[PDB]
Amino acid sequence: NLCPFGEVFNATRFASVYAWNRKRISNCVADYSVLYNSASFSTFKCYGVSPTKLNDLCFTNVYADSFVIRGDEVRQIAPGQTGKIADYNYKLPDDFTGCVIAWNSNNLDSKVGGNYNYLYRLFRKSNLKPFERDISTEIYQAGSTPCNGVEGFNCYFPLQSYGFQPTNGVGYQPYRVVVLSFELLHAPATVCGP
Amino acid sequence: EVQLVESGGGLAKPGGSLRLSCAASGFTFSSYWMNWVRQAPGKGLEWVSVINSGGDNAYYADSVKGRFTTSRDNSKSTLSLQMNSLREEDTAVYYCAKDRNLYYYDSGYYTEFSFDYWGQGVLVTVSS
Amino acid sequence: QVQLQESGPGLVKPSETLSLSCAVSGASISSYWWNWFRQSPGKGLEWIGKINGNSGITYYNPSLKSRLTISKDASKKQLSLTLTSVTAADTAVYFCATRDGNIVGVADYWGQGVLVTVSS
Amino acid sequence: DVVMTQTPLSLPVTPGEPASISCRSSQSLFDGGHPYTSLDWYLQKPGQSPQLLIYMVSNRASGVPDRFSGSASGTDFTLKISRVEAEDVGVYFCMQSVEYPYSFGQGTTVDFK
Amino acid sequence: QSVLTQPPSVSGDPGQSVTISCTGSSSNIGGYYVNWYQQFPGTAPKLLIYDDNNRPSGVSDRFSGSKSGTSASLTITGLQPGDEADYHCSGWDSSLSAVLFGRGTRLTVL
Amino acid sequence: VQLVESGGGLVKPGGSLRLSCVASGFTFSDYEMHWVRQAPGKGLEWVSVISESGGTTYYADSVKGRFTISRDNAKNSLFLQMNSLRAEDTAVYYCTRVVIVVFTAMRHFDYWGQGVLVTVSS
Amino acid sequence: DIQMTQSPSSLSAPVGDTVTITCRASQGINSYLNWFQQKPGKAPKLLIYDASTLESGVPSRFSGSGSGTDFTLTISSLQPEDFATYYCLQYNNYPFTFGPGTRLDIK
């Protein structure tokens, strides 16, 4: 059994950062050094565990989260960050044990007039909790009077698009991000290195 | 072994309310996310809802969203489903599945459920 | 392309009832919170008040209440302001507005305003 | 309820230079720990209806040139035109949508120098 | 596509092999795990194959599960007249974010 | 309007070398900063880029892993640290800039720098 | 990585004539080509900051044209200041690639 990283990394379309995908990966043998030596990634940062050791460690379950952001926000995908991604879209815990991979995708996820398929939650009542997900589009109430699903002053549609374009800056260009998480639970280990 | 015993089915006129209770023993109940699945008479299977290890965040199918409500009491080690505003297309058998896997964060978004231990199935007919 | 036009009487006596109507185009009334603002001669704006679009909930200015009524006609594609007993300070240009949050930015759909004088 | 105090009453500025306008709220408009509250920055040219520039405390409206910026430090809200141009002349004001009556600030007339 | 399509019934002579097919989509099986359940008429379903390849402890090695791209399959080698049941293919859909199921297949032996 | 570099010189292969590009006459934070090197062999070579805030850095195929670009907006400075130099890294280095309108980058490589010289020999 | 191949490597032309240079690309780019001129020992100069548009201050002699893969640069009136080496830069995808260059001399 070989862990199915091939359709997680090389998926034809990634999600948005508010409605991010997850995938459970169990009962398989994964070689992490073959990923680390792809060298086609802008960012490969492992927290809580050192690479070159992932083949010598064995975990109950691992999870692969996939989402697209802009280049300047990959700094926010990390333990202890703060922003409009670490608070409202994707939050990583202080006890993270995994690896954040990220790579430029201006070829696939950008269009001449703009690509409005990729969204992010701009306003939210409170900060996300570690690994929580929020896909509601309820009108955000910014004042004292309720917003019964109708827009106006004081009431905002919370999501908003990135509007990727082929010639945006390098910090405003699409970046595909895959967060691998490893869990050590009191149970037989199923996903394990070679 | 692992025992799932359902109770609380019967007759209800369209618009009535019922409360199914699933007594679960043989495993640490608090630790596993618990499901509710349902089967129409002779027509496939269909998933209904899921509840966490602590009962804080429940998720429902869209066909039953806003009407049914899943709950669980880890003190008495029981599961419960409160059905309100019933329709006659809710004539089914309701199984109390269990999540095969073990999750760490109890609040994150986990994305594949395999059910290893089901229940006998209470028959809920909604008619007059 | 949402376009609003205010309209009403140009001159009213110092005790007659002011009735303005905002005609909306390019959008359904039911979607927005329609605000009514007024601007005194050579001064800043003032918030007269708002009406919900689908529902009928309406909020007014506390200082200006007891003389105010905001309503609508969704089938007629209209909103309406009426202010009773305009007394020496209800001389202004009137706007209807609403902010449209979206997937592409935020544009807030103002009106062109109409003039109202109090004196005869 | 809530009254706004705009610090520059008139801001004579020369093109190609930074311009900073301030708006102090009567009370704190930040209830939940948040970056944004409801406070808009508007540009009114003489004889027209206002034009939205910064809708939330820092978010820029659609179709607004990138020279305008907004931010807040507590009860103070600052707007900055980092490079004034020929079109930035008019009145700038400060509208809070948090409370009931949507109060405004006095206003600041940007003057050619 | 949010729909998993099984045949309504498959048939095979005893002792031979039988293949049941479940063709989903990309957000379905194509990108996520599959589970096959078995249900004897009048009783609950039990986990037969999980994660599209494995078997739990009590399940015998006559049932094999596979999944390759869009479609998954179940193979039964050796057809005892006693394993007649309903076989439920259970993908997961990222679009709906909920567990999918199939119409079930009535395995009949000749 | 003034992009002036420093830090070049002669180094033996394997060593480290940190070039700098001071920029005056414009707001530094409005611009995306690129490095372009040219060996005595005819042809310009794009090396690296850093964004207005320093959050995103991109490197060429040849110079990735060794060279690291950085910028300090306070001191209007743009640095390029070079580790594990080699013989093919002897070139004239020019710091250039691109303007960020709102999110788009247009008028690419508007002005250039003076251009330091980096020679690598024993 | 997008490869660019300028068709002229070195061409000479008398003063008072017009020259034309090509900068073809492998992957199609949608008008994302900045032309540059370099003097020996000096930093290059931006000439045409799109497929067509002229940069502020460059004489009106130069003229870019084309989009997609096959671009073109025309130099209207040759001068003593015209002769230099011309490069082309694509900024569609981020590992930007200049061209090999084109040397221009007086005939």
PDB file of N, CA, C and O in Angstrom, chain F residues 107, chain G residues 35 46-64 73-74:
ATOM      1  N   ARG F 107       5.117  48.229 -15.935  1.00  0.00           N
ATOM      2  CA  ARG F 107       6.375  48.937 -16.163  1.00  0.00           C
ATOM      3  C   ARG F 107       7.529  48.178 -15.509  1.00  0.00           C
ATOM      4  O   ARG F 107       8.222  48.681 -14.623  1.00  0.00           O
TER       5      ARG F 107
ATOM      6  N   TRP G  35      10.669  45.271 -23.747  1.00  0.00           N
ATOM      7  CA  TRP G  35      11.909  45.356 -24.504  1.00  0.00           C
ATOM      8  C   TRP G  35      12.923  46.221 -23.767  1.00  0.00           C
ATOM      9  O   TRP G  35      12.569  47.197 -23.103  1.00  0.00           O
ATOM     10  N   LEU G  46      14.858  50.401 -20.214  1.00  0.00           N
ATOM     11  CA  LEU G  46      13.537  49.943 -20.624  1.00  0.00           C
ATOM     12  C   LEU G  46      13.033  50.784 -21.791  1.00  0.00           C
ATOM     13  O   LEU G  46      13.081  52.016 -21.746  1.00  0.00           O
ATOM     14  N   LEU G  47      12.553  50.122 -22.838  1.00  0.00           N
ATOM     15  CA  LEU G  47      12.093  50.827 -24.027  1.00  0.00           C
ATOM     16  C   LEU G  47      10.585  50.733 -24.212  1.00  0.00           C
ATOM     17  O   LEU G  47       9.912  51.766 -24.282  1.00  0.00           O
ATOM     18  N   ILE G  48      10.031  49.526 -24.282  1.00  0.00           N
ATOM     19  CA  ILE G  48       8.620  49.301 -24.580  1.00  0.00           C
ATOM     20  C   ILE G  48       8.063  48.373 -23.511  1.00  0.00           C
ATOM     21  O   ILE G  48       8.280  47.157 -23.562  1.00  0.00           O
ATOM     22  N   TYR G  49       7.345  48.942 -22.544  1.00  0.00           N
ATOM     23  CA  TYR G  49       6.945  48.211 -21.349  1.00  0.00           C
ATOM     24  C   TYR G  49       5.665  47.412 -21.538  1.00  0.00           C
ATOM     25  O   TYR G  49       5.013  47.060 -20.551  1.00  0.00           O
ATOM     26  N   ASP G  50       5.303  47.102 -22.774  1.00  0.00           N
ATOM     27  CA  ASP G  50       4.270  46.116 -23.058  1.00  0.00           C
ATOM     28  C   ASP G  50       4.518  45.610 -24.471  1.00  0.00           C
ATOM     29  O   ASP G  50       5.595  45.805 -25.034  1.00  0.00           O
ATOM     30  N   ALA G  51       3.521  44.940 -25.042  1.00  0.00           N
ATOM     31  CA  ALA G  51       3.668  44.501 -26.423  1.00  0.00           C
ATOM     32  C   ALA G  51       3.794  45.691 -27.368  1.00  0.00           C
ATOM     33  O   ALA G  51       4.450  45.595 -28.411  1.00  0.00           O
ATOM     34  N   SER G  52       3.178  46.823 -27.017  1.00  0.00           N
ATOM     35  CA  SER G  52       3.118  47.984 -27.897  1.00  0.00           C
ATOM     36  C   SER G  52       3.510  49.301 -27.242  1.00  0.00           C
ATOM     37  O   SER G  52       4.096  50.154 -27.912  1.00  0.00           O
ATOM     38  N   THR G  53       3.205  49.490 -25.962  1.00  0.00           N
ATOM     39  CA  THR G  53       3.260  50.814 -25.355  1.00  0.00           C
ATOM     40  C   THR G  53       4.697  51.276 -25.135  1.00  0.00           C
ATOM     41  O   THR G  53       5.548  50.522 -24.659  1.00  0.00           O
ATOM     42  N   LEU G  54       4.957  52.542 -25.457  1.00  0.00           N
ATOM     43  CA  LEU G  54       6.273  53.150 -25.302  1.00  0.00           C
ATOM     44  C   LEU G  54       6.456  53.670 -23.884  1.00  0.00           C
ATOM     45  O   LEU G  54       5.502  54.146 -23.264  1.00  0.00           O
ATOM     46  N   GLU G  55       7.685  53.583 -23.386  1.00  0.00           N
ATOM     47  CA  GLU G  55       8.017  54.106 -22.074  1.00  0.00           C
ATOM     48  C   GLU G  55       8.188  55.624 -22.134  1.00  0.00           C
ATOM     49  O   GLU G  55       8.545  56.198 -23.167  1.00  0.00           O
ATOM     50  N   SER G  56       7.909  56.277 -21.008  1.00  0.00           N
ATOM     51  CA  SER G  56       8.047  57.724 -20.912  1.00  0.00           C
ATOM     52  C   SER G  56       9.496  58.147 -21.119  1.00  0.00           C
ATOM     53  O   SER G  56      10.388  57.737 -20.371  1.00  0.00           O
ATOM     54  N   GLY G  57       9.728  58.975 -22.137  1.00  0.00           N
ATOM     55  CA  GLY G  57      11.037  59.532 -22.397  1.00  0.00           C
ATOM     56  C   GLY G  57      11.809  58.871 -23.514  1.00  0.00           C
ATOM     57  O   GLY G  57      12.783  59.458 -24.002  1.00  0.00           O
ATOM     58  N   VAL G  58      11.416  57.676 -23.935  1.00  0.00           N
ATOM     59  CA  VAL G  58      12.057  57.003 -25.060  1.00  0.00           C
ATOM     60  C   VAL G  58      11.626  57.711 -26.338  1.00  0.00           C
ATOM     61  O   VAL G  58      10.443  58.054 -26.479  1.00  0.00           O
ATOM     62  N   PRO G  59      12.537  57.977 -27.272  1.00  0.00           N
ATOM     63  CA  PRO G  59      12.139  58.595 -28.539  1.00  0.00           C
ATOM     64  C   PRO G  59      11.056  57.789 -29.242  1.00  0.00           C
ATOM     65  O   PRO G  59      10.927  56.577 -29.064  1.00  0.00           O
ATOM     66  N   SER G  60      10.266  58.490 -30.056  1.00  0.00           N
ATOM     67  CA  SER G  60       9.138  57.869 -30.739  1.00  0.00           C
ATOM     68  C   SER G  60       9.562  56.998 -31.912  1.00  0.00           C
ATOM     69  O   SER G  60       8.702  56.592 -32.699  1.00  0.00           O
ATOM     70  N   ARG G  61      10.857  56.717 -32.055  1.00  0.00           N
ATOM     71  CA  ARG G  61      11.317  55.886 -33.161  1.00  0.00           C
ATOM     72  C   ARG G  61      10.895  54.434 -32.971  1.00  0.00           C
ATOM     73  O   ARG G  61      10.389  53.795 -33.899  1.00  0.00           O
ATOM     74  N   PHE G  62      11.087  53.899 -31.771  1.00  0.00           N
ATOM     75  CA  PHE G  62      10.840  52.485 -31.536  1.00  0.00           C
ATOM     76  C   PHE G  62       9.345  52.197 -31.496  1.00  0.00           C
ATOM     77  O   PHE G  62       8.543  53.059 -31.129  1.00  0.00           O
ATOM     78  N   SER G  63       8.973  50.979 -31.881  1.00  0.00           N
ATOM     79  CA  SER G  63       7.578  50.578 -32.008  1.00  0.00           C
ATOM     80  C   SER G  63       7.464  49.078 -31.790  1.00  0.00           C
ATOM     81  O   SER G  63       7.932  48.294 -32.621  1.00  0.00           O
ATOM     82  N   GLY G  64       6.858  48.680 -30.674  1.00  0.00           N
ATOM     83  CA  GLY G  64       6.556  47.283 -30.463  1.00  0.00           C
ATOM     84  C   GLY G  64       5.237  46.878 -31.096  1.00  0.00           C
ATOM     85  O   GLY G  64       4.346  47.695 -31.315  1.00  0.00           O
ATOM     86  N   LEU G  73       9.767  44.179 -32.799  1.00  0.00           N
ATOM     87  CA  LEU G  73      10.210  45.523 -32.451  1.00  0.00           C
ATOM     88  C   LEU G  73      10.799  46.187 -33.683  1.00  0.00           C
ATOM     89  O   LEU G  73      11.712  45.641 -34.305  1.00  0.00           O
ATOM     90  N   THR G  74      10.290  47.365 -34.029  1.00  0.00           N
ATOM     91  CA  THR G  74      10.771  48.126 -35.172  1.00  0.00           C
ATOM     92  C   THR G  74      11.447  49.393 -34.670  1.00  0.00           C
ATOM     93  O   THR G  74      10.941  50.047 -33.754  1.00  0.00           O
TER      94      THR G  74
END
